[PDB]
């Protein structure tokens, strides 16, 4: 019965990302995963 | 609701935002679907 939207507008629109040797991950849980909001942002060279 | 797009009943037709400012992903792409039917039917 979870209804809170997922904070997906926090990683794709980031200003500066982490380095290669210090890659950071974000814990995502207790939300509704709506992946339809990702296609309208920008296409991706690799979507495997 | 029959002819009022104001309330929750929205129009099912939406327009694109094709502009040269938008990069790849939002650009228009022409698609040609060459439907082929190869079977025992007489070929013309």
């Amino acid at each position, epitope marked *: 019965n979870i209804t809170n939207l997922c904070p997906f507008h*926090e*990683v794709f*629109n*980031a*200003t500066t*990302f982490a380095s290669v040797y210090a890659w*950071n991950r974000k814990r995502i849980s207790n939300c509704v995963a709506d992946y339809s909001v990702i296609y309208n942002f920008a296409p991706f060279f690799a979507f495997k | 609701c029959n002819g009022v797009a104001g309330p929750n009943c929205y129009s099912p037709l939406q327009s694109y935002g094709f502009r040269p400012t938008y990069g790849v992903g939002h650009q228009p792409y022409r698609v040609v679907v060459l439907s082929f039917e190869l079977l025992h039917a007489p070929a013309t």
Partner: antibody
Amino acid sequence: VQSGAEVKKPGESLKISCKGSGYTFSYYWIGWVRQMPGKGLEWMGIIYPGDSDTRYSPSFQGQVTISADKSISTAYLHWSSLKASDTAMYYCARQGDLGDWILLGYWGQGTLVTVSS
Amino acid sequence: SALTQPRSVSGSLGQSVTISCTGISSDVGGDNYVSWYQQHPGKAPKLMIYDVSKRPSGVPDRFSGSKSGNTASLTISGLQADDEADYYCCSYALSRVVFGGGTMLTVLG
């Protein structure tokens, strides 16, 4: 140096400009930030010298468009169906090699558009 | 979120002043997306403090910042007569530019 602000009525599609120097208009982001009398700065959007991947503010998605000129390195703005609350001091800012792409390294002069009838 | 800033401050010549800045958000990639701008009354704004972990070029060393959670502070020393100007903190962690409520620096003497 910037162009003057002529008194216009809401709905005449006025235009503002700003002149910058000291860089190459090739790969440096550039945008416009307004300032209404009595409030702080308000960022609207930016434009890229190449592919114009313009990213407008959520409060400025359909209120103002960027029409900067690349051949003369002079920025321009276009409006349509203006309002009385559009009077603000528009400042032209660029990316600059100081910070990131969204960081504003330099600023323009600023012109206060006056709207009256 | 909206950045909260004091409307008016009261400094002094030779003393220091700390301008508060709350409501700063953060995204994946860092939390130092804090920058300050110096705008003189009726003049053109100039970049003064950005990336408080570093020091900008041309800006005097009497300007510095700090970070403490979601609240930032702008430490300014050596207040003079020409230092009277507007200051605004900016946050660009989510690729969106936001400004504070406006700060007016006043000095006594």
